[PDB]
Symmetry: C2
Subunit: 49 residues, 2 copies
């Protein structure tokens, strides 16, 4: 048969502090964001009733 | 005599946490700004040779 089948693996995603994992959820919960935020405050404004 | 002369006092500027003074240098050093920055970070970029 002239059919060539490939099964690629799940690609990795590089998180912060040189840690890589295939799941964004567990990867963020383990090592945090790639580019850290200098500070600790994110201010939110709400518009509605 | 024939003219009404008034010498006004030095006006008071309101600084943070209910403090007032006339000199902006001394008022800012001992009381701080009126609206405190919710955070601890100010990022400065430089452009030049």
């Amino acid at each position: 048969m002239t059919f060539e089948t490939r099964i690629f693996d799940e690609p990795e995603l590089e998180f912060g502090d040189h840690h890589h994992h295939q799941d964004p959820r567990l990867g963020l919960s383990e090592a945090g964001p790639l580019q850290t935020f200098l500070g600790d405050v994110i201010k939110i404004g709400v518009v509605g009733n």
